[PDB]
Structure formats: structure tokens, C-alpha cells
């Protein structure tokens, strides 16, 4: 029961996915050759949530790896845990996507998507009771954004009563990584508003801030950033894979975190994150962890949470702890600072607890916030997009693939509507 199918699309999506599979593997005591070397029966009890068993006690992640160019996936295969994946689950094209949503969604991606869908169907048929799908991609490129969105559309059409959740890497206000980012992001976001149940919004600038300000890390690698993201990802599904006092679930989280269907864009966080120098200096108390969790500096989106209000927040705690303490802390936060929580939803904080903590920690926590502050990201994207579109700058690359102006206007309209909705509850 409760099988989850993973899809990783494009460069960033595949890279983050590799790290995620490493982390999950280590959590379950699975080595790169698919052999189990754990010490606890809890490690295998719910291994089926992420893994499929093969002859000779081999475990193979239910992961589908998708790209329009072979490089990234060749690197992944060459990598440490790369040999753990099913070879038949690498689905790739030959021509690149040129950071072009239209190529991912309408042309190059359209040619490949049926093949991906077939693999997806095959995997879903092996599920006793499939919970849903997890997707990893970027919003600013062509493959993860265009192809990824397309895949989501297809799967929701075919499996409309399953959970569809994405970890989506978004552009950052200071330092864009591509010139057409606003166009791609807007085109993706338009589709995600209507075709996903929840989306975790990750901002690389926030990750860098975490690495520098919090972790005191002089020289963060993308690998290190990926690790953090993977940790957050693992947190979300912990309650499917292990016992607890309050057993959470994806669906439960959705129920408690989405008060209106379109408002499903979350700011993720993780705790504790402490510098290697200052480890003995910190006392690892639930209160202190809570404080870390709620600190804007420990968020992974391009928002100031203090510039908005929390509609709902879900906290998932890992390790041994007093439920009394947890509840009291939650009460204290809300009573003290009631202005930062929407007044029309009493008890804005939901708590879940899983007994088994991650490696190397006695306690940890994962934070998921639905804040009206997220509107700032959307507003900024919209401004950027309009700045370009009003001059039809770069547009020939998209019209050449058959897109029309009207689609862009529709996207803009959707964006603005979303922003307006967010402003309502602000």
C-alpha cells in the first residue's frame, strides 16, 4: 500500500533526483548495488513506498529519468548511485531544448512524451495501491519546465484521483540564470496552477543564503545545495515510511495546507542547520528547533515571510519528543504573534511526528508554509515577463514553434488572478 512514483526531468531535476535517491537509499540501508545492509526491521517494513524488489534481494527505485539531451543522464549513470536505477527507466531524446518552454511542451517534448507515459503506466500497474507522483524539475529552462509540465498534464488526465506533487526550482530575484527565464516560468506556472495538488517552491538564492549565513560554508557546491533539498523532500514522506505518534501522509498534508484549490505553493524549510564549528554550542531542544523552523533565514523560497501572513503551516518532527512540548510551542508562536497568522483559520499550525530520526541527528524537523508572501515572487515574475512581452522581445523563438500571443496573455491573466487571490488573504 502507498507506493510513490518519482519522475525527474531535465538537468536540475535529474541532479536533485540523484541526490534524493542517495539520501533515501542511505535512510533505508540500501547500498548502490541494491543490497540491504540495515540493522532494524523498520528499514524494510515500508521500503515498497519508494523501491521495487527484484531477484536476489535487489531493490530498484520507482524512478523515471527524463531528458531531451543525453549528457546529464549519462553523468547520473556514471555517478555513485547511478547503477541502482533500472536502465529501461532512462527515457531520453537527442536534440536539446534550448531553454525553450515551447520545445519542451509542444515540439521536441511532444515527440518523447508518449514513451514516458508508457513507462509511467507500467510502473503504476506494479502498485498495489499507488498514492501518487513526485516530480523534480526547474521552472526556468525548457525540459523540466515545458516537458515536465506536459508530463504532469498527461498524468493528471489519466490519474485524476491521485496526488501530484512537485519540487520546483524557481528563478531568484537577484541573479537570473537564463534570459528567457520569466517566459518559461510563467508558462510553466500557468499549467501548474491547474494541474498539481502541491508544489514546493525552491529558490537557489535562499539556499545560498542558508549555506553562507547559517551553515557558515565558504564554498557551497550545487551538490551541497541538492543535499539540503533532498533532506526536505525526505521529510515530507517520512510518515509513509516509518512509525510515529502522529502518522502524517501526503494527502493529509494537502488537506491541512490547501484551503483553496489554487493556493498550493509552499515554502519549505529544514532544521536543524548548524555550522560544523558551532555544534557543541547549540542545545538541541524542541523549542530551539521550532525557532529555527519559523526563522525567515531558514526558509528556501525568495520571500520575506514577515511581508505576508501564514494561511497554514505544517511541521513534521523526527526523533523522540514530548507531544506536550510540541503543542505548547505551537500555541506560544500563534498567541505571541497572531498578526502573522490569518485570523479566519484557528489553529494555523499542524504537527506530525515520526519516531525514527534521520542519520546523525537525534531530532530534526521539516517546515511547510503556505504564506501570502509568495505573491511577491509571482508579482516580480509578472513584472519581468510584461517588460519583455510588451516589446515582443525573444518571442520569435516561441512563435516559431506554433505558440500564439494569446497564450502568453492567458498566462499573464492567470498569474494576476493568483496574485489577487493571495492579496485577498493578506
Amino acid at each position: 500500500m502507498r507506493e510513490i512514483v518519482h519522475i525527474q526531468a531535465g538537468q536540475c531535476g535529474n541532479q536533485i533526483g540523484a541526490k534524493f535517491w542517495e539520501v533515501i537509499s542511505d535512510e533505508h540501508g540500501i547500498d548502490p548495488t541494491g543490497s540491504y545492509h540495515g540493522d532494524s526491521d523498520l528499514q524494510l517494513e515500508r521500503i515498497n513506498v519508494y523501491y521495487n524488489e527484484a531477484a536476489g534481494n535487489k531493490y530498484v527505485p520507482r524512478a523515471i529519468l527524463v531528458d531531451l539531451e543525453p549528457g546529464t543522464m549519462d553523468s547520473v549513470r556514471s555517478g555513485p548511485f547511478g547503477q541502482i536505477f533500472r536502465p529501461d527507466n532512462f527515457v531520453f531524446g537527442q536534440s536539446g531544448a534550448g531553454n525553450n518552454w515551447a520545445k519542451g511542451h509542444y515540439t521536441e517534448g511532444a515527440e518523447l512524451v508518449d514513451s514516458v507515459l508508457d513507462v509511467v503506466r507500467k510502473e503504476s500497474e506494479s502498485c498495489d495501491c499507488l498514492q501518487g507522483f513526485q516530480l523534480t524539475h526547474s521552472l526556468g529552462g525548457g525540459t523540466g519546465s515545458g516537458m515536465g509540465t506536459l508530463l504532469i498534464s498527461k498524468i493528471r488526465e489519466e490519474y485524476p484521483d491521485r496526488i501530484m506533487n512537485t519540487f520546483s526550482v524557481v528563478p531568484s530575484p537577484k541573479v537570473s540564470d537564463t534570459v528567457v527565464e520569466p517566459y518559461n516560468a510563467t508558462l510553466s506556472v500557468h499549467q501548474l496552477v491547474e494541474n498539481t495538488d502541491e508544489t514546493y517552491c525552491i529558490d537557489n538564492e535562499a539556499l545560498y543564503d542558508i549555506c553562507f549565513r547559517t551553515l557558515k560554508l565558504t564554498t557551497p557546491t550545487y551538490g551541497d545545495l541538492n543535499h539540503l533539498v533532498s533532506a526536505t523532500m525526505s521529510g515530507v514522506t517520512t510518515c509513509l515510511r516509518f512509525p510515529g505518534q502522529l502518522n502524517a501522509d501526503l494527502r493529509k498534508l494537502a488537506v491541512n495546507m490547501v484551503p483553496f484549490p489554487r493556493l498550493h505553493f509552499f515554502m519549505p524549510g529544514f532544521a536543524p542547520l548548524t555550522s560544523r564549528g558551532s555544534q557543541q554550542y547549540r542545545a538541541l531542544t524542541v523549542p530551539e528547533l521550532t525557532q529555527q523552523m519559523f526563522d525567515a533565514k531558514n526558509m528556501m523560497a525568495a520571500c520575506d515571510p514577515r511581508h505576508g501572513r501564514y494561511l497554514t503551516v505544517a511541521a513534521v518532527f523526527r526523533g523522540r519528543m514530548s507531544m506536550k512540548e510540541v503543542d505548547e510551542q505551537m500555541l506560544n508562536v500563534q498567541n505571541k504573534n497572531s498578526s502573522y497568522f490569518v485570523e479566519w483559520i484557528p489553529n494555523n499550525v499542524k504537527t506530525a511526528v515520526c519516531d525514527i530520526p534521520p542519520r546523525g541527528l537525534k531530532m530534526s524537523a521539516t517546515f511547510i508554509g503556505n504564506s501570502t508572501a509568495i505573491q511577491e515572487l509571482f508579482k516580480r515574475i509578472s513584472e519581468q515577463f510584461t517588460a519583455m512581452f510588451r516589446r515582443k522581445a525573444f518571442l520569435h523563438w516561441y512563435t516559431g514553434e506554433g505558440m500564439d500571443e494569446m497564450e502568453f496573455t492567458e498566462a499573464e491573466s492567470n498569474m494576476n488572478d493568483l496574485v489577487s487571490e493571495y492579496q485577498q488573504y493578506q
Binding site: S95, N99, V179
Partner: protein
């Protein structure tokens, strides 16, 4: 897999190509006798053969290549020859002599394409101003467009300098090339010899240069551009991405190409050579590889290709700093004006060379309204020449017509107007 085909046309282009191939060999450990797939097609004897087209109407440069060190490396066909050169005459390239050889070239290209399982497209090396590199190249490009359509056609072009030249029919030819590669080439990357000389004088502290050095420098840039296809790294850029990111409007597609750090052994030790510093150097007016001030122009779109040791955080910081500067002006309509590419593989040093080993190097490709000034200057030159109908009998005497020139001028004017509009 990811595969691309090089085309080298003229004398200058061929020279550049030699350097490039040497660099490639140094990178991938291939010996001069052939003892990677992206550039080198592999055969059944542990032998690696370049995947290039080498074309010249004069059989001299090609002959040199055929006799020199890397003769066993190249195929006896890839190196193609003619009988007489165009002699700085677009008309003898595009109309008269080019239509004898072009078919063969096309066939070769087709063959090369057939040998690939995912052709990313083309890299072409020619020269605005030369007889072959102007007309013949244009002809080739048109044919390619007709054939393949949606295969990337990138160009590397030697732009004529303002205050210096080596041919007194160079305005005409260049103009003609511009006219007939405006509706074909997706990107035309630019290098200028005067600029390179200036760079040598300033940064390298060398004031006795030669063409070889220039070629090597160009090759470095080329390698940087193409490093993402042949090595691992965060942010692997593709040949198809450049078009998407550096071409806001289809006529506007000439971006400048600059490299940092271009520095000798003596002040490599003095300098820290951090990422931010390198980035700053990239945007400095004097360090640019053409004769234009980017203070007199707004940056539409820029692309940065970091190669070697680079913490992406540092790169981000550098970019932020650049953005902060008042400045370095960008256009109103392009806020996100940066593309970032990173490779773990560092730059490679060529024995008996100008440059020392570095930890990290950066190549910047920038599309800006600064080139408008250059275009205007060229137009003015053309006008000055064509008013008296100077040299026109040579061009008209091999195919061209009075009227074509006028059309070209009109096109140039239109381009200028477009640039002006973009500036607003």
C-alpha cells in the same frame, strides 16, 4: 550523443581551425597521427578523425595543412581545394567560382551528418572582408538553411577594424555578407584584430605579436564555448541555447566574444584570479575583443561560460555586483540579462604559447547596441567608396548588378533603425 560539425572557410578561418584542432588534441590526449564523439569521429583501429569541413579556393593554406604536423589527423577529403581565389571579391565567391565547389562541400556535410546520431548543428569559421569568407561562406549558409532548417548554424567571424585594415575593398564585401547572412545565420560571434592587439599590449604585456597568437586566443574562446558538450559540470550549456538566449529579434544576432583572464606568467602570481574579479574584467571596456565602447550602448543579453574551479555562489555574487553598477546599462525590456554555464574541466595550455595555466577562466558572449556604432561606421565607409562607383566594375564584371548595392545599403539602414528602436 551530442555531436557537432566544424566548417573552416578561407585563409583566416583555416588558420583559426588549425589552432582549434591543436587545442582539441591537447585537451583529449589525441596524438597528431590520430591515436570525444562530439568533435572526433572514431573508427575501427583506435584512430580518431576530426569531423570538419576545410574549404579554400586558393590551394596554398590547405596544402600547408596537408604537409604539416597534423596531416595524418585530417581526412584526405575534409580538406577541400580549388584553383584560384576570389581575390577580395564577393562576386567571385558567391556567384562565379563558388558554384563549382559548393556541391562537393554540401555532399561532405551530408555525409558527416549521416555519421551522427544527434547533430546539434554547425560551427562555421570565415571572415567579413575576405573574398572567399564573404561570398562563398554566404552561399554555403544559404544552402545549409535550405537543407536542414532547424539545425544550429553558429558563425565565428573576423570583423573589420575601424582604424586599421589589410584590403581596400573590405567595406563592400562585408556589407554584402551582412545582406546575405541576415536571414540564415542564427549567431555570428565577433572578433577584431585591433582589439586583440590592444589586449596583448595591455594585459599580456606583449608588444610584438603575430597572427598565430591571435588564432590561439580565438581557439581558447571557441573551446570555452564548446566545453559544455565535451565535459561534465553544473549548468551544461548547449549550442541550441545560445540562439534562444542571445537573439531577441531575428535580424539582431551579432554578439561580441570576450575572454578573461588573458594574462602572462608574471602577473598571474600577483593577481588573486578570483571569480568576481574575472567577471569584472569581462565587463571592462578595454578588455573587450572588438573596437567598441559598451558605455555607448545598452546590453540586451549576456552569456557567461565559467570554466574550472567555480563555486556557483561566488558567480551569483559577481553577477549581483555587476547588476548593481550604474554604468553597465541594460535595456528596459530585459531584466534577467544573464546566462550562466559552469564546467569542472579547467583551461588547457598549449606548448610554446602566450598564456599560463589558470585555476579558472571565463568566456563572455554579449549582444549589445554598442555594435550599432560600428555598423554605422561601416555604412559610412561604404557610402564614401560607392559614391564614386569605385571598384564596382570588378563586382559587376562577374555577376552583380547596380541596385544590389543600394538594396544592401537600405537593409543596413533598416538594421540601424531597429537597433535605435531597441535602444529606446
Amino acid at each position: 550523443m551530442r555531436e557537432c560539425i566544424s566548417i573552416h572557410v578561407g585563409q583566416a578561418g583555416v588558420q583559426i581551425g588549425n589552432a582549434c584542432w591543436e587545442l582539441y588534441c591537447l585537451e583529449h590526449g589525441i596524438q597528431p597521427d590520430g591515436q570525444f564523439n562530439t568533435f572526433f569521429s572514431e573508427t575501427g583501429a583506435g584512430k580518431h578523425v576530426p569531423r570538419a569541413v576545410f574549404v579554400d579556393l586558393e590551394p596554398t593554406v590547405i596544402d600547408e595543412v596537408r604537409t604539416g604536423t597534423y596531416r595524418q589527423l585530417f581526412h584526405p577529403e575534409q580538406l577541400i581545394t580549388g584553383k584560384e581565389d576570389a581575390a577580395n571579391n564577393y562576386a567571385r565567391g558567391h556567384y562565379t567560382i563558388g558554384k563549382e565547389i559548393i556541391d562537393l562541400v554540401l555532399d561532405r556535410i551530408r555525409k558527416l551528418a549521416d555519421q551522427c546520431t544527434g547533430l546539434q548543428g554547425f560551427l562555421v569559421f570565415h571572415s567579413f572582408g575576405g573574398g572567399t569568407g564573404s561570398g562563398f561562406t554566404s552561399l554555403l549558409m544559404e544552402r545549409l538553411s535550405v537543407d536542414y532548417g532547424k539545425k544550429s548554424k553558429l558563425e565565428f567571424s573576423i570583423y573589420p577594424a575601424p582604424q586599421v585594415s589589410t584590403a581596400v575593398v573590405e567595406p563592400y564585401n562585408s556589407i554584402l555578407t551582412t545582406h546575405t547572412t541576415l536571414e540564415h545565420s542564427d549567431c555570428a560571434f565577433m572578433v577584431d584584430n585591433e582589439a586583440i592587439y590592444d589586449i596583448c599590449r595591455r594585459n599580456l604585456d606583449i608588444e610584438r605579436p603575430t597572427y598565430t597568437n591571435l588564432n590561439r586566443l580565438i581557439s581558447q574562446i571557441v573551446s570555452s564555448i564548446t566545453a559544455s558538450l565535451r565535459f561534465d559540470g553544473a549548468l551544461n550549456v548547449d549550442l541550441t541555447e545560445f540562439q534562444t538566449n542571445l537573439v531577441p529579434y531575428p535580424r539582431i544576432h551579432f554578439p561580441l566574444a570576450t575572454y578573461a583572464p588573458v594574462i602572462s606568467a608574471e602577473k598571474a602570481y600577483h593577481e588573486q584570479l578570483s571569480v568576481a574579479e574575472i567577471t569584472n574584467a569581462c565587463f571592462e571596456p578595454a578588455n573587450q575583443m572588438v573596437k567598441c565602447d559598451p558605455r555607448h550602448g545598452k546590453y540586451m543579453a549576456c552569456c557567461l561560460l565559467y570554466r574550472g574551479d567555480v563555486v556557483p555562489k561566488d558567480v551569483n555574487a559577481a553577477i549581483a555586483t555587476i547588476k548593481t553598477k550604474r554604468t553597465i546599462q541594460f535595456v528596459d525590456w530585459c531584466p534577467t540579462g544573464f546566462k550562466v554555464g559552469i564546467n569542472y574541466q579547467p583551461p588547457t595550455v598549449v606548448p610554446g604559447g602566450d598564456l599560463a595555466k589558470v585555476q579558472r577562466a571565463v568566456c563572455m558572449l554579449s549582444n549589445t547596441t554598442a555594435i550599432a556604432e560600428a555598423w554605422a561606421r561601416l555604412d559610412h565607409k561604404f557610402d564614401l567608396m560607392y559614391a564614386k562607383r569605385a571598384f564596382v566594375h570588378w563586382y559587376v564584371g562577374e555577376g552583380m548588378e547596380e541596385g544590389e548595392f543600394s538594396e544592401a545599403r537600405e537593409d543596413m539602414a533598416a538594421l540601424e533603425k531597429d537597433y535605435e528602436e531597441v535602444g529606446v
